[PDB]
């Protein structure tokens, strides 16, 4: 439940890559496999 | 599954006796195969055990917080003071025999999760039940007692096995099977069937 | 020198080495004619085709050339005598043996090679997941599609 | 590059040789260049090898290629298998893709 | 009282951040061989310091013990499974009528915690048991 | 739902006898005795005793599958010696020692204070 | 009902390469300088060491399922301490006026070099190895 | 949810030691570690049983009906 | 378009697929209470039986091998060699 | 696509799978309930009535029972409802839809099915509990593991159909696969890891066990083999008993690096008359390799004999291990104190090299190689420098590992693990990488806000110096995380893209087959190969042989 | 006396550390197991719930009841319901206890095993008595109630064994060691430097002589002497677990002997 409430989605150059700037803001690990991997993020 | 990306289904349950045992008389609630470790490099798992062991012993909450100065040594050092081999190994005896096990074993407590998705909730198994009205083909899902998908890919395999007959029997006698009458001049299903 | 060919001859030999208990101390009863002419004759009964005409009789020769090479280099006079002290009996057996095995290594009409191949390539392909060239899936894709815009072109001159 | 080579004494030895790898293609004009051994010049661009050396050669590279994809991964696959592919890709005298633009046009029945 | 600030990725561009305050603001005037190796506090520029690196994580990964002694992807897997775990999702599960609810008979707080589980209320509503495990080849089953 | 009742571990069902004695076919004076609703506890104990008899040429045992509680004891004895006897003896020698232990323990237990 | 080779050996080296119950022994032969020996021995059941006087014997006697005691009061080619059984595999021409052989005692190996053994040494499986004092 | 009657692992009755344990903590002002040992819980299979229990029932009882 | 028993070029040896269909088809007849041309050493399973009707070349079935042009060649299970 | 060439068929079943070491390679464990559902239309025949009637009496809810009884007219007598379900006198000609019984042939598959091996026929074995139970060495062809995979089962309905499965698609028949022209089923996990130990020269067994191990092998000739030792104690070696599993007539020579018909390292392999003479038994011998004891035993003794080889080897080795035990713990990842010293500094110099290159480069002294930016050359160096560093600290670690070290211990069997695993778990993890380059400057001229702009030093750009043991540092963590992700992502991609290719290939060749004139043509008849594989030889019946006439000096070819 | 011989060291209501010598390891074990799994005992194996206004589930509570230890000394004269010719149960094969608890006070009322109330006729045999070793005398904490919560049960305790279910085990935990110094070499210790400095030393060593440096390997010695200790849930006095253990095992053996006979 906590994890669902803290979720993030990104519709649609490289967007599923964990990105430098993400440090501090989005969890580096938590993310679904395949399908929407890297698109669905978790604060 | 542990807490380190290592899931597994039960494969059999053994009663206390058949289980390998500790000289202290302690026996495991669960046994995992050493082989699911070298490759997954999920070391923390191992560590956590070292820690959780010491902890349970000394009634101290084990602190496996990330970036800390907690060492596998400092811990092994603590566990020894507790009269146990500093790594988690402990001579163990084979339940059947009572003899000692030629190889000491990694024994300790480790937090394990009970994941949803339990066999009984999946065991579907049909043998010709209800079929779709539109295609006269078996229905989907097991809640409905449907059929399993013998899709494209499975077919190719059968073709590869050169098992012609089976194939026909799969794509016909089971699922779609229908008799149609045709005009010996215009191969169309335009022949009025008046059977009597 | 190591190429996949039907009939592991080396084995047949070993399987005579002890099926007839061959002693490396006494002399064989093999006639130079036996061996040489025998090996030769063996090469006549391998077959993969049976038309009685020129064309096909020539294909048949082609499809056996290599194996035969293997066969000749292995079943050579010295070898037979000096390398593995066979005897007219063992040797004679080894031959009758190869023939049969060969005949057993032929493909059976019906074998659906189309798929059998497609899959034999698709599978080990789905095992691929990773000195600056385009390889792996992408490239294989490049190929199968017969693309013209390949990313890593190159010309290798000597 | 490394190249095994028969030595006068019989055994294969290793006689390293200079080879130029290129980052761009134009086969048609490089063979003609002097000094190079036009007998061996090669390219991973089978299409080009096709247009220039004929299709029977193209088939070769086409395989030489596929092969490398599969073997660079340590994995092996019996010849025949890939052979069949390439050939099926090469019988119609040209380079027919495994795409729809190629084999579905093929001459086959409608249903396939 | 201005002892903290709220920084977004854009302003982050213009700042220098020390990880540990301590270990990064003492002057360099023997080292435990079992502790990991860290570089140095090379910067007469620090404008900020991290509240605590463990904070770069989020709910799910937060419950992993020592995820810093674990191969990258395995941490992501666990995070996806912690959501399929059983336990008491709410002390009032008995008064709620909802499509399926799975509750553990005897939930146990883990012997191995994270200084960040205190906020995720894990110890209070644990999901998992503390079983005595043995990594060993037994019946081959 | 596909789990067998626990009692099937120690209760013979229908058409199940505690023992079945079939003559081994490979060796002479050999016999494979199958035990029903019995596990390692007995199997291994009897296997061990059966190996004290010097007229015993062979003796092993196996629970072919954990799922089921049954096992097989194989016995080969010296010409003229019937393994069934070799089995009898063993069980006895076992009971005797057992009784013994029972006593000696009960003795000591009584000299104890607490 | 025979014996196939007798000879006292002097152990020159004893090597325990990452094994704790096995050592590969290499002892030379007293008498005929031509003869040398390479053997695998269970140092746990039969210790050995720097320069020992070892008596060796081969034979093929004192294949039906193995039995054990009783005969503890019967036959007894127990005039030795250590004994093994094995299967010999390859006979080799060390060339020159010398010839060698190879035996495998369930993995414990032995190579024997000499020449007059052309007769005294078997050509089949059977082959016991007896050692004493 | 209430103290497990008996230890999963070995079977040593444990459900009759929760209150005892708690008291040893609050009043006897002892550390979880010794409190355990005094209650006769010497092996870890039997120490995690109590040490880890999260007596949730005490929160389920606050629900009026 | 037929081909005399002579000029026969197809494999003398029976293909696995041919024998698996022969085996199936006879096994099926046997399962339908059809006469058995062999003596059962105590066999009961149709297939297992049919296997033994082949092992004793007593299966009155013939295989028609169509070539790719349209022609063919009729081989009898009595002729065909069963190595495999 | 989903209705004509791919349909939902009846008589299918699916559940979770788990390994079962006491099941034969070619069987499959079908949970009683599933067997009670799936049925098989068997016609009544004097060769069976007794069993058939007996089952019909057993009814649809006791295993060896049945459901439905079909008659002449085509009526269906439903055996679970029917005033006359306890009556019914079977009539020759009728049909008794019976439960699936033991030894039935069934098509068992795991998806995705990108093989023939993904679908194979297994002998049924009805058993308790509810998971399909399968032999481990059937694992790889289906590419399964037991972390939750589910598998599909289909039941032949026609007498022919069955035959087609038991004669063409049987697991036995598939051990030597035509694709890799080698076998496609080896020996894994415990059986492999163990068989090795059980083999060590240092490994001996005595009476009580020997007698059990022997008995354990079902095909035992009950003839106790004479001990390798008869001295102070009659001891057998590991090889000794294992050899019981290997049948007679199997021969196998090997020779690894230092082999020498006396293999001081218990190297290579030598098996004669089905008796293992020398060499430790591990992956190369028993793996699913080309030369393999399996490739040989299939070709020589027959598919079935070789099918059995598996269970036997397993039953024996498994038992032996069940009593020897085997495990792993952190301990197994700890390296010699002086070693970590030598390692930590091994890196210490790698860093100095990078640093010394860097300063060189910044002085513009560097000489740019041809075709590369002085910048490109710079990077490539450091990356090389760091890789070597990792690999040597790693090697450095691998040497400590005592033969008793379980990790190393599995690596030697070839049952899991490789240099890399050790190297990372024990010494330095390594240089992280995204898109083939070392971590980028997501921020302006820097990696994270914890570094100063322009900083190409290893720490800054993704070089995780620590080990999984020692633990990573935030930055290290984050970095290693980035790569981690790159992985998981192309993971999801490399799957679909390949899945697609797998099809285009399959459609493209679909209809190609070896016709009766040994030719290879597609539907049209258009010849594709005048002789299949150019030798009209079947891929499975092939093996790598050496053409003794190509190599060797001219003198040796003559000698 | 004859073979097998003991040497109790410790002893009390719950434990019995003792040395069992001159026996086969096979037996030491068979004994050990049997103790763990085949000694009979009385335990609730059926709960009839009348009212449960509690926070816990019926079967959840029922499960715990089953686990609550009950007296079992005279269990040898109580039958297995499956053998009693009664329909279901009776006072010849069972023991029925009642549990009734009402949340009276607004101060949480606890429900202990001491509240079970034998209703059936014990027939003068010591059997089925909530076993209590508490200090305060409140054997096991079954459940807790709120303001006005009810719990009205009726259990039927039956004879059973650890095999059908673990609730029926009287043993708890059994220590077991043999050859404290690895003289027998039945193990190969895992080390980093000195397997002797890294691996602890069992109390049991004190009761045995060291290995004597240069002494060869004793290749003929087998396992004699075992250092055990039986903990006891208490439904049975420790001495009994050991006896009844020995007994049971002995009967098991006898029944095979009796088998051949009827054969
Ligand atoms: Zn019409
Ligand atoms: Zn416990
Ligand atoms: Zn009654």
PDB file of N, CA and C in Angstrom, chain J residues 275-316:
ATOM      1  N   UNK J 275      33.988 -49.283 -16.701  1.00  0.00           N
ATOM      2  CA  UNK J 275      34.680 -49.178 -15.429  1.00  0.00           C
ATOM      3  C   UNK J 275      35.543 -47.939 -15.507  1.00  0.00           C
ATOM      4  N   UNK J 276      35.331 -47.037 -14.570  1.00  0.00           N
ATOM      5  CA  UNK J 276      36.062 -45.788 -14.535  1.00  0.00           C
ATOM      6  C   UNK J 276      37.480 -46.025 -13.976  1.00  0.00           C
ATOM      7  N   UNK J 277      38.475 -45.873 -14.845  1.00  0.00           N
ATOM      8  CA  UNK J 277      39.879 -46.112 -14.501  1.00  0.00           C
ATOM      9  C   UNK J 277      40.617 -44.938 -13.868  1.00  0.00           C
ATOM     10  N   UNK J 278      40.434 -43.748 -14.429  1.00  0.00           N
ATOM     11  CA  UNK J 278      41.077 -42.571 -13.866  1.00  0.00           C
ATOM     12  C   UNK J 278      40.418 -41.262 -14.288  1.00  0.00           C
ATOM     13  N   UNK J 279      40.461 -40.291 -13.380  1.00  0.00           N
ATOM     14  CA  UNK J 279      39.900 -38.986 -13.642  1.00  0.00           C
ATOM     15  C   UNK J 279      38.709 -38.702 -12.765  1.00  0.00           C
ATOM     16  N   UNK J 280      38.649 -37.487 -12.226  1.00  0.00           N
ATOM     17  CA  UNK J 280      37.529 -37.069 -11.404  1.00  0.00           C
ATOM     18  C   UNK J 280      36.351 -36.912 -12.358  1.00  0.00           C
ATOM     19  N   UNK J 281      35.147 -37.230 -11.890  1.00  0.00           N
ATOM     20  CA  UNK J 281      33.955 -37.102 -12.718  1.00  0.00           C
ATOM     21  C   UNK J 281      33.231 -35.789 -12.471  1.00  0.00           C
ATOM     22  N   UNK J 282      33.181 -34.936 -13.488  1.00  0.00           N
ATOM     23  CA  UNK J 282      32.479 -33.666 -13.382  1.00  0.00           C
ATOM     24  C   UNK J 282      31.844 -33.319 -14.726  1.00  0.00           C
ATOM     25  N   UNK J 283      31.480 -32.054 -14.913  1.00  0.00           N
ATOM     26  CA  UNK J 283      30.818 -31.586 -16.139  1.00  0.00           C
ATOM     27  C   UNK J 283      31.308 -32.108 -17.495  1.00  0.00           C
ATOM     28  N   UNK J 284      32.611 -32.061 -17.726  1.00  0.00           N
ATOM     29  CA  UNK J 284      33.157 -32.528 -18.994  1.00  0.00           C
ATOM     30  C   UNK J 284      32.797 -33.992 -19.276  1.00  0.00           C
ATOM     31  N   UNK J 285      32.783 -34.812 -18.232  1.00  0.00           N
ATOM     32  CA  UNK J 285      32.492 -36.232 -18.391  1.00  0.00           C
ATOM     33  C   UNK J 285      31.010 -36.519 -18.472  1.00  0.00           C
ATOM     34  N   UNK J 286      30.292 -35.979 -17.495  1.00  0.00           N
ATOM     35  CA  UNK J 286      28.876 -36.222 -17.353  1.00  0.00           C
ATOM     36  C   UNK J 286      27.991 -35.046 -17.721  1.00  0.00           C
ATOM     37  N   UNK J 287      28.603 -33.926 -18.070  1.00  0.00           N
ATOM     38  CA  UNK J 287      27.804 -32.783 -18.460  1.00  0.00           C
ATOM     39  C   UNK J 287      27.077 -33.176 -19.728  1.00  0.00           C
ATOM     40  N   UNK J 288      26.475 -32.209 -20.408  1.00  0.00           N
ATOM     41  CA  UNK J 288      25.765 -32.488 -21.648  1.00  0.00           C
ATOM     42  C   UNK J 288      26.701 -32.045 -22.737  1.00  0.00           C
ATOM     43  N   UNK J 289      27.948 -32.476 -22.639  1.00  0.00           N
ATOM     44  CA  UNK J 289      28.950 -32.081 -23.614  1.00  0.00           C
ATOM     45  C   UNK J 289      28.968 -33.016 -24.807  1.00  0.00           C
ATOM     46  N   UNK J 290      29.789 -32.676 -25.795  1.00  0.00           N
ATOM     47  CA  UNK J 290      29.933 -33.462 -27.010  1.00  0.00           C
ATOM     48  C   UNK J 290      30.508 -34.863 -26.733  1.00  0.00           C
ATOM     49  N   UNK J 291      31.719 -34.917 -26.184  1.00  0.00           N
ATOM     50  CA  UNK J 291      32.345 -36.201 -25.903  1.00  0.00           C
ATOM     51  C   UNK J 291      31.607 -37.025 -24.867  1.00  0.00           C
ATOM     52  N   UNK J 292      31.004 -36.315 -23.914  1.00  0.00           N
ATOM     53  CA  UNK J 292      30.227 -36.879 -22.810  1.00  0.00           C
ATOM     54  C   UNK J 292      29.829 -38.343 -22.668  1.00  0.00           C
ATOM     55  N   UNK J 293      29.853 -38.805 -21.418  1.00  0.00           N
ATOM     56  CA  UNK J 293      29.492 -40.172 -21.077  1.00  0.00           C
ATOM     57  C   UNK J 293      28.067 -40.424 -21.569  1.00  0.00           C
ATOM     58  N   UNK J 294      27.309 -39.346 -21.760  1.00  0.00           N
ATOM     59  CA  UNK J 294      25.926 -39.440 -22.221  1.00  0.00           C
ATOM     60  C   UNK J 294      25.840 -39.562 -23.738  1.00  0.00           C
ATOM     61  N   UNK J 295      26.596 -38.726 -24.447  1.00  0.00           N
ATOM     62  CA  UNK J 295      26.605 -38.787 -25.898  1.00  0.00           C
ATOM     63  C   UNK J 295      27.012 -40.215 -26.290  1.00  0.00           C
ATOM     64  N   UNK J 296      28.052 -40.718 -25.636  1.00  0.00           N
ATOM     65  CA  UNK J 296      28.562 -42.058 -25.909  1.00  0.00           C
ATOM     66  C   UNK J 296      27.598 -43.170 -25.526  1.00  0.00           C
ATOM     67  N   UNK J 297      27.036 -43.073 -24.331  1.00  0.00           N
ATOM     68  CA  UNK J 297      26.113 -44.085 -23.846  1.00  0.00           C
ATOM     69  C   UNK J 297      24.802 -44.093 -24.620  1.00  0.00           C
ATOM     70  N   UNK J 298      24.436 -42.978 -25.250  1.00  0.00           N
ATOM     71  CA  UNK J 298      23.191 -42.980 -26.012  1.00  0.00           C
ATOM     72  C   UNK J 298      23.431 -43.700 -27.303  1.00  0.00           C
ATOM     73  N   UNK J 299      24.513 -43.302 -27.963  1.00  0.00           N
ATOM     74  CA  UNK J 299      24.913 -43.865 -29.245  1.00  0.00           C
ATOM     75  C   UNK J 299      25.245 -45.346 -29.206  1.00  0.00           C
ATOM     76  N   UNK J 300      25.830 -45.783 -28.097  1.00  0.00           N
ATOM     77  CA  UNK J 300      26.271 -47.155 -27.954  1.00  0.00           C
ATOM     78  C   UNK J 300      25.278 -48.163 -27.418  1.00  0.00           C
ATOM     79  N   UNK J 301      24.667 -47.852 -26.287  1.00  0.00           N
ATOM     80  CA  UNK J 301      23.732 -48.779 -25.672  1.00  0.00           C
ATOM     81  C   UNK J 301      22.261 -48.602 -26.022  1.00  0.00           C
ATOM     82  N   UNK J 302      21.898 -47.438 -26.557  1.00  0.00           N
ATOM     83  CA  UNK J 302      20.514 -47.195 -26.933  1.00  0.00           C
ATOM     84  C   UNK J 302      19.890 -46.040 -26.177  1.00  0.00           C
ATOM     85  N   UNK J 303      18.895 -45.354 -26.758  1.00  0.00           N
ATOM     86  CA  UNK J 303      18.281 -44.233 -26.042  1.00  0.00           C
ATOM     87  C   UNK J 303      17.816 -44.630 -24.645  1.00  0.00           C
ATOM     88  N   UNK J 304      17.015 -45.683 -24.563  1.00  0.00           N
ATOM     89  CA  UNK J 304      16.507 -46.115 -23.274  1.00  0.00           C
ATOM     90  C   UNK J 304      17.598 -46.425 -22.271  1.00  0.00           C
ATOM     91  N   UNK J 305      18.568 -47.255 -22.645  1.00  0.00           N
ATOM     92  CA  UNK J 305      19.626 -47.580 -21.701  1.00  0.00           C
ATOM     93  C   UNK J 305      20.179 -46.283 -21.179  1.00  0.00           C
ATOM     94  N   UNK J 306      20.375 -45.328 -22.073  1.00  0.00           N
ATOM     95  CA  UNK J 306      20.925 -44.063 -21.647  1.00  0.00           C
ATOM     96  C   UNK J 306      19.918 -43.267 -20.864  1.00  0.00           C
ATOM     97  N   UNK J 307      18.642 -43.501 -21.114  1.00  0.00           N
ATOM     98  CA  UNK J 307      17.646 -42.771 -20.363  1.00  0.00           C
ATOM     99  C   UNK J 307      17.885 -43.195 -18.909  1.00  0.00           C
ATOM    100  N   UNK J 308      17.939 -44.507 -18.689  1.00  0.00           N
ATOM    101  CA  UNK J 308      18.176 -45.061 -17.363  1.00  0.00           C
ATOM    102  C   UNK J 308      19.471 -44.534 -16.744  1.00  0.00           C
ATOM    103  N   UNK J 309      20.534 -44.468 -17.532  1.00  0.00           N
ATOM    104  CA  UNK J 309      21.801 -43.990 -17.006  1.00  0.00           C
ATOM    105  C   UNK J 309      21.592 -42.818 -16.064  1.00  0.00           C
ATOM    106  N   UNK J 310      20.687 -41.924 -16.416  1.00  0.00           N
ATOM    107  CA  UNK J 310      20.444 -40.764 -15.577  1.00  0.00           C
ATOM    108  C   UNK J 310      19.992 -41.087 -14.167  1.00  0.00           C
ATOM    109  N   UNK J 311      18.846 -41.736 -14.054  1.00  0.00           N
ATOM    110  CA  UNK J 311      18.342 -42.088 -12.743  1.00  0.00           C
ATOM    111  C   UNK J 311      19.393 -42.807 -11.911  1.00  0.00           C
ATOM    112  N   UNK J 312      19.980 -43.858 -12.480  1.00  0.00           N
ATOM    113  CA  UNK J 312      21.003 -44.605 -11.775  1.00  0.00           C
ATOM    114  C   UNK J 312      22.041 -43.646 -11.215  1.00  0.00           C
ATOM    115  N   UNK J 313      22.823 -43.029 -12.097  1.00  0.00           N
ATOM    116  CA  UNK J 313      23.853 -42.100 -11.659  1.00  0.00           C
ATOM    117  C   UNK J 313      23.308 -41.218 -10.551  1.00  0.00           C
ATOM    118  N   UNK J 314      22.092 -40.730 -10.758  1.00  0.00           N
ATOM    119  CA  UNK J 314      21.444 -39.875  -9.780  1.00  0.00           C
ATOM    120  C   UNK J 314      21.203 -40.619  -8.480  1.00  0.00           C
ATOM    121  N   UNK J 315      20.355 -41.633  -8.527  1.00  0.00           N
ATOM    122  CA  UNK J 315      20.064 -42.374  -7.323  1.00  0.00           C
ATOM    123  C   UNK J 315      21.324 -42.645  -6.500  1.00  0.00           C
ATOM    124  N   UNK J 316      22.387 -43.123  -7.137  1.00  0.00           N
ATOM    125  CA  UNK J 316      23.612 -43.412  -6.393  1.00  0.00           C
ATOM    126  C   UNK J 316      24.247 -42.176  -5.814  1.00  0.00           C
TER     127      UNK J 316
END
